[PDB]
Symmetry: D2
Subunit: 199 residues, 4 copies
C-alpha cells in the first residue's frame, strides 16, 4: 500500500533559468509530498472498506484516491520528463512518429501548447500513445486525473499547468511558461516510454 | 465480504396494478442480478490492484465499481421501499419532520416527483436525511451513483427513474409512473430508516 | 430559426422484425417530438437572457439546451442512419477507410458494438470522422450530448442505446438489439456523410 | 451583450497585510479582465449561433460561456465581499441566521474554511442562501462555475481558492490564506445580499 516520494534525479536549481529553483523545491517537497501522504492514507482506508464489503465507503473514497493517486502518478512522470540536459527535439522513431501523426515537430509543439494553454482551471497536457491505434495522440486532463487510468493512453510527456507549476515565476502568463519548458524536456526519457510499448 | 442478491419480501405480482409483474421480475431477477455479479467481479480485481499498489488499475476500475456497487445498493433499498400494503401517509416523527421541512405531506410529493421527473437520462430521486443539519432533503443522482456514497445524505426513500423501471407499462409518460408509485410506498420502512439515524 | 420534427423517410413498420413498429412510433412521434418542442421553448428563453446580458440565466439554461438540442440533433441523424433496404456492408472509400482504421469491416462492428454496450446508463455510440486527423474514430456520449458539439468529431453513424430504444422488444439484453441493428444500417447515408467532409 | 471590468472600490494595496497589493493588481487587472474579454467574445458568438439555429455551435460554446461568464460573476461579487474596513463578525439578522443554521459564528467559520480548503483543484467556497428552504447553506464550486447558475443558491460571500488568489503571498499554504481573509470580509455587503432576498 505504501507509496514514497521519489528523489529528484537533479538539483532543485538545475532547470534554471527556465524553471526557478524555488518552484521546483515547493513543487517536489510540498505539493507532491502531500499527494503521496494522502494517497497512503486513502489506500489504507480503502483496504478496510474492501475487507468489510462496505460499498458506500469504497465509493466515498473514490474522489480522494483519484486525486491523490493521480497526483502521485502525474508528478512522478513529470520529474523524469525534465532534465538539465534536456531541450532540442527527439530523434529516431519518436521523431518519425511525431511527424507522421502531427506533420512536423513544430506543429506538434503548437498542438500540445494549445492543449495546455486551453485547460480551464487546474490540469495537465499530455502527449500519449494509443497502443490500440498505434499512433500518438494529444490529450488534456483535469485536476490530477491521470492519463492512463482515465483514458487508456500511455503517457509519454506531461505538462503541468496547475498555477503552482508556474505562477511564482511567470505569474499568469501561461504561454511564457509553456515556451520555457521546451528547453528542459528530457527527450531521452520520452523516447524510452515510447519504445517501451512497441515490442 | 461477498455480496448477494437479496430476495424480494413479496411476490413479483404483489405490486399490481401499480407496477406489473413483468417489470418486477426483470428488475429484480435480471437487472439487479447483473449488478451484484459484476460488483463481485469488480471487487476481486480491485483487491488484486490494491495488493500490488497499482494506482492506475484502481482508478481504471472506479467507474465499474461505482456503477455496479451503486446499482446493488440502490436496488437493495428500493425493494424494501415498496410493499403491497403500502401507500397512504407516514405517521409519527417522519410525517412531522416532512411537514417541518416541506410544509405539508403533499408538498413533499410534489418536490420529490419534480426531482425525479427532472432527471435527464437515467437516475434516481431520493428523500434523504442530512445528519449534519438534522433535516430532510431531496436529491437526485445520475445512473447508479448511490446517495450516501456521493452526497453523504442518508437514504430514506428512493424512486428509480431508469426507463427499465417503467417503460413496459407506462411507456414515455414518466409522471404516470410517479403517480402510481405512491400507492405502494412502504412508509414503515421509510420511518425505520429515518429513526435509525436519530440519536 | 425554428426547429421542426423531421418526417420519417419510411413507415413506422418498415424496420421490422429488427425494430418493431411500436418502438419506432413512440421513438419518433413521442420522444423526438418532446425534444423538439422543449428545444424551441428553451431557445426562446435563452434569447431573452442573452438580450438582457443575464449570464446567470444563460448558465442555468445550459443543461436544458444541451439535453433537448442534443436530443433533436441525435435523433435527426439516427432516422437517416436506418433504412428498410439497409444492412450489408458499405462500399467505396467508406469501407476502405474502415479497413484502414479498424483492420476489417467486422472488427469495426465489434468495436462499435463494444462502445455502445459499454454505455453506463443512457447514451449513444458513434462512428465519427476526425477531420483534423483525417481518420475514423469511435466515441460514446452520455444522455443526449451530441457528438460534434461536445467532441468535434463529425457524426457518421449513431446507435441509440437509451433503454427506450430497445426495451419493449429486447428487454435488458442490449447485445440482442445491437445484433439486429446492423441489418437496417443505411450505409448509403453513412457514406454520404463521410464524403461530405472530405476535401 | 457588452460586459465591463468593474472598478475596484478601493486601492490595490488597501487589504494589506492580509492580501498584498501585487496579488490584488494581478487578480483584478489581469485575471478578471481576461474573463470579461472572453465572455464578450463568447456571447457575441452565441448570438450568431442562436440567430441561425445552429444547435451544435450553441452547445460547443457552453464550456467557454460558463467558464468566462462564471469568472466574471464570481470575481465581481468577490471584490464587493472584501473591504479595508472589513473584518469582525456580522450582526443583526445575518448573525442570527448564522447561529441558527450553523450553531455559532465560529462553527460557521470552521465549516466554510473546511469547504474552501477541501476544493480539489481550482474553485470557490460559498456561503449561500436557499430561498426555497429559507436557511443558509455552504457550497463549493469547481473552476468558475457560478453559485446561482449551477445550484440556485443566492451568493452572499465567496472565497476564491484558485492558486492565483494566494500563491504569491502564502505559496501553497491555503489554510494560512483562509485565516487571513477573515480580516477583510465586508460583512456590510454580505448583509445587504442577505437582506435583499427577505422581502
Ligand atoms: K407486482
Ligand atoms: K419498423
Ligand atoms: Mn503540480
Ligand atoms: Mn433499476
Ligand atoms: Mn432515443
Ligand atoms: Mn480568481
Amino acid at each position: 500500500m505504501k507509496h514514497s516520494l521519489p528523489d529528484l534525479p537533479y538539483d532543485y536549481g538545475a532547470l534554471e533559468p527556465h524553471i526557478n529553483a524555488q518552484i521546483m523545491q515547493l513543487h517536489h517537497s510540498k505539493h507532491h509530498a502531500a499527494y503521496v501522504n494522502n494517497l497512503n492514507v486513502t489506500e489504507e482506508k480503502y483496504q478496510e472498506a474492501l475487507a468489510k464489503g462496505d460499498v458506500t465507503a469504497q465509493i466515498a473514497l473514490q474522489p480522494a484516491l483519484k486525486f491523490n493517486g493521480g497526483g502521485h502518478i502525474n508528478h512522478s512522470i513529470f520529474w523524469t520528463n525534465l532534465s538539465p540536459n534536456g531541450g532540442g527535439e527527439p530523434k529516431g522513431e519518436l521523431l518519425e512518429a511525431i511527424k507522421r501523426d502531427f506533420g512536423s515537430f513544430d506543429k506538434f509543439k503548437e498542438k500540445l501548447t494549445a492543449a495546455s494553454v486551453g485547460v480551464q482551471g487546474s490540469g495537465w497536457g499530455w502527449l500519449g500513445f494509443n497502443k490500440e491505434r498505434g499512433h500518438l495522440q494529444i490529450a488534456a486532463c483535469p485536476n490530477q486525473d491521470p492519463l492512463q487510468g482515465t483514458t487508456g493512453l500511455i503517457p509519454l510527456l506531461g505538462i503541468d499547468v496547475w498555477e503552482h507549476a508556474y505562477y511564482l515565476q511567470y505569474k499568469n502568463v501561461r504561454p511564457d511558461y509553456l515556451k520555457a519548458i521546451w528547453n528542459v524536456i528530457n527527450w531521452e526519457n520520452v523516447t524510452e516510454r515510447y519504445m517501451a510499448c512497441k515490442k
